[PDB]
């Protein structure tokens, strides 16, 4: 990635050769590793246009295996640009650019032709949305009357997505795919300032309500594959949704509720963990909004701690707690003010809240049952000693 910053052509030339070799040859080969270098090369807006144009010309003649690799690799290329160059993404919707729109549309059609079977549709759907996002006005027309051919194929795809997203269709594979695709759309929306207030915001609103019921139904655990639930997927959704509507989130409570399964707890804390550590855009909401829930967070710490220690002195249920406990400890390490807000203050007959927190952390240091946790609790307790964090223990009297 660092090398690609300057000498882009050198890397870029090597890829172009492999495509031509595969293009002319007719005996399918599996040495696509040259193709898969797109995932790492630094990309800028102008450079990205080049990638689409070159692949577009050569895509149709490629073999089946080659076609998949370029699609995935090209998909991950999109995110590299967005993160590394946030500003350029805003300007795309701020001011129209036909050239960007034109290249995506041609590529859009080629992919759609490529995918016919349900298995194919599952693979390619995540990409197609990204391209559709790239051409803004085609969305507007899709909402209104549809052109004979210009916006005909697009509108058919967009509504086809929703059916599986709502579970109407009797296809599990597409149901899983629709989730991934929608999430990326939700994630991408976050970057748009919303001052444009384009259809992008409106389009997401249509799918958000359906999406949440699919991923955040305690009765039914969404299980993509071997794992009981796609923990990684849920984190992406919740983090994004927060940024869109931070004022009063309604599903924070669903996870934060004690009755919900642990995984909902696990997803919650990690979700708060990204908020603290990765906030590039200033106009995003910040962790301060969540301080109001501190009281409920602490109770979760207490109960998890109580059961975690007891087990060490079912099979996976016990193991689950330890993982949750480790995550909670790391959270305090990241930010101590999150859990210290709204202090209870020492009761005449009962201990306070800052005290009960420390005592729980201390009884883990000498454990040696859970060496990883013990190591962490040391760092956590060492951060609550910085001069800055001493004040929060009891703001009434910090030196008693």
From Swiss-Prot:
It comes from the Eukaryota. Changing residue 351 to P: In a cutaneous neurofibroma from a patient with neurofibromatosis; somatic mutation. This is Neurofibromin truncated. It comes from Homo sapiens.
């Amino acid at each position: 990635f660092s090398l690609s910053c300057n000498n882009f052509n050198a890397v870029f030339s090597r890829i172009s050769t492999r495509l031509q070799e595969l293009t002319v040859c007719s005996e399918d080969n599996v040495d696509v590793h040259d193709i898969e270098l797109l995932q790492y090369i630094n990309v800028d807006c102008a450079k990205l246009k080049r990638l689409l144009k070159e692949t577009a010309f050569k895509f149709k003649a490629l073999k089946k295996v080659a076609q998949l690799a370029v699609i995935n690799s090209l998909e991950k290329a999109f995110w590299n640009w967005v993160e590394n160059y946030p500003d350029e993404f805003t300007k795309l919707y701020q001011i129209p650019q036909t050239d960007m729109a034109e290249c995506a549309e041609k590529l859009f059609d080629l992919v759609d032709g490529f995918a016919e079977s349900t298995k194919r549709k599952a693979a390619v759907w995540p990409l197609q949305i990204i391209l559709l996002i790239l051409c803004p006005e085609i969305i507007q027309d899709i909402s209104k009357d549809v052109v004979d051919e210009n916006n005909m194929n697009k509108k058919l795809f967009l509504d086809s997505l929703r059916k599986a997203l709502a579970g109407h269709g009797g296809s599990r594979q597409l149901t899983e795919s629709a989730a991934i695709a929608c999430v990326k759309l939700c994630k991408a929306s976050t970057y748009i300032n919303w001052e444009d207030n384009s259809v992008i915001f409106l389009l997401v609103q249509s799918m958000v309500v359906d999406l949440k019921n699919l991923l955040f139904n305690p009765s039914k655990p969404f299980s993509r594959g071997s794992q009981p639930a796609d923990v990684d997927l849920m984190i992406d959704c919740l983090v994004s949704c927060f940024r869109i509507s931070p004022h009063n989130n309604q599903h924070f409570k669903i996870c934060l509720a004690q009755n919900s399964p642990s995984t909902f707890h696990y997803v919650l804390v990690n979700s708060l963990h990204r908020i603290i550590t990765n906030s590039a855009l200033d106009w995003w909401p910040k962790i301060d909004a969540v301080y109001c829930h501190s009281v409920e967070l602490r109770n979760m710490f207490g109960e998890t701690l109580h059961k975690a220690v007891q087990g060490c002195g079912t099979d996976l249920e016990t193991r689950s707690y330890k993982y949750l406990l480790l995550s909670m400890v790391k959270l305090i390490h990241a930010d101590p003010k999150l859990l210290l807000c709204n202090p209870r203050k020492q009761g005449p007959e009962t201990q306070g809240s800052t005290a009960e927190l420390i005592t729980g952390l201390v009884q883990l240091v000498p454990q040696s049952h859970m060496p990883e946790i013990a190591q962490e609790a040391m760092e956590a307790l060492l951060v609550l000693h910085q001069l800055d964090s001493i004040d929060l223990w009891n703001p009434d009297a910090p030196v008693e």
